[PDB]
Design a protein around this ligand. Structure first.
Ligand code: HEM
Ligand code: TWO
Length: 393
């Protein structure tokens, strides 16, 4: 069994993980990370299988490094993400309906128009702007919390909260050790927003509570289902949108493709999720000795799954380093796979579609105009700044 002291959460890896991915995949199906006493999987075949194999590889002992058999979680674990069947079943079914294609039909017009308003306002203002601040971050922060049905006061808390959540999956470091003085402030505010009386419209929050009335989940599950939406909903989409915008800005070939064929706007996002894999890593815990990739993972030990590495595995993907709108990216693992596969994927897709729709209409050319700054995070490839300059037709 290959053994290595490679550190996936060293700052150099986090800055640029591609060498690490290649080393990982090359070495074998399974690499023992001596530093963390976890078993790493980087190839598409094993990552895909580990993800779907909930029976052998559970989520309730944590999907971060921390082992909940022994270690105190930083917050009450997600009753979706950090739950196994049968406990997972009813909260999952509630969100899978509420966030599913048919349910979002009612929001498509509105999100597309909102994006048009945002893009037209921005371009009226300037042809030189930050793609992160002015687009990737602006847009989800309009439409998503609205659709959930939370108030406008405090929305600035969503990103630091999500950032903390993603950091928490990794080891203790000045990334993860981000607050304490403010973490409790953030947790106090998110939880408050989950209460039935905090929520408005017949938005997603109210629909969770209605499902509870029908007995699909309990009233004590309801706020925690809402909470899932407020932890996973905003930070993933901002950073995913920052990534697709970065990819276009540095791939003028693929921008020209989108312009030519408007329909690639609906599926550009998924190639960007494969290519970038915003969510890089998740852990599982072995429920028993499992023989995967020639290796036996001892019962009780953790696997670390490298979604990025799998999404760039040449065993599965032709020229995987290429950002290619002509790829069929179906079967990518950027949203995971199996029973825990991103229940929010349709929302993220619609957000991307709306924003790309509106931008491709108005923007001939797009270039990097300044240094880009990544925000380092243990789990989520995240973005501080992507300065761009556009040319209008
Ligand atoms: C509004 C947007 C989103 C929402 C509301 C959302 C919500 C969720 C939720 C609640 C889960 C847990 C489901 C379960 O355990 O059954 C999940 C899983 C996941 N999401 Fe998302 N998500 C969103 C966008 C994204 C994006 C853009 C990505 C990646 C770029 C992403 C990556 C994932 C991954 C990798 C998992 C799998 C967790 C696992 O296998 O343990 N999500 N999402
Ligand atoms: C994909 O990542 C997540 C999924 C669900 C949750 C959740 O709070 O349900 C949180 C996540 O990251 C912080």
């Amino acid at each position: 069994l290959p053994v290595s002291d490679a550190d996936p959460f060293a700052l150099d890896v986090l800055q640029d993980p591609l060498p690490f991915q290649a080393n990982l995949r090359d070495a074998g199906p399974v690499v023992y990370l001596r530093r963390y006493d976890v078993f790493a999987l980087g190839r598409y075949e094993q990552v895909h299988a580990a993800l779907t194999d909930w029976q052998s590889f559970q989520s309730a002992a944590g999907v971060g490094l921390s082992n909940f058999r022994y270690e105190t979680p930083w917050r009450p674990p997600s009753i979706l993400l950090e739950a196994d069947p049968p406990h997972h079943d009813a909260p999952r079914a509630v969100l899978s309906k509420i966030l599913g294609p048919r349910a979002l039909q009612k929001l498509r017009a509105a999100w597309i128009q909102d994006a048009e308003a945002l893009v037209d306002q921005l371009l009226a203002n300037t042809t030189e702007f930050d793609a992160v601040t002015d687009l990737a971050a602006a847009f989800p922060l309009r439409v998503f919390p609205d659709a959930v049905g939370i108030p406008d006061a405090g929305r600035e808390n969503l990103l630091p909260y999500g950032d903390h959540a993603f950091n928490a999956f990794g080891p203790a470091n000045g990334l993860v050790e981000k607050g304490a003085p403010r973490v409790a402030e953030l947790s106090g505010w998110v939880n408050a927003q989950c209460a039935r009386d905090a929520l408005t419209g017949d938005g997603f929050g109210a629909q969770i509570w209605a499902a509870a009335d029908r007995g699909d989940i309990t009233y004590e599950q309801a706020p925690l289902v809402v909470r899932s939406l407020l932890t996973a909903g905003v930070d993933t989409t901002v950073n995913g949108l920052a990534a697709v915008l970065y990819a276009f800005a540095t791939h003028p070939d693929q921008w020209a493709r989108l312009r030519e064929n408007r329909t690639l706007a609906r599926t550009a996002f998924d190639e960007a999720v494969r290519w970038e894999s915003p969510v890089q890593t998740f852990f599982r815990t072995a429920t028993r000795d499992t023989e995967i990739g020639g290796a036996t993972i001892p019962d009780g030990k953790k696997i670390l799954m490298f979604l990025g590495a799998a999404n760039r595995d040449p065993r599965r993907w032709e020229n995987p380093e290429v950002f290619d709108l002509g790829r069929n990216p179906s079967g990518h693992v950027g949203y995971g796979m199996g029973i825990h596969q991103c229940v929010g994927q349709h929302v993220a897709r619609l957000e991307s579609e709306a924003l790309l729709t509106a931008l491709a209409s108005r923007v001939h050319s797009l270039e990097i105009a300044g240094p880009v700054h990544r925000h380092l995070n243990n789990t989520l490839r995240s973005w501080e700044s992507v300065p761009v300059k556009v040319r209008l037709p």
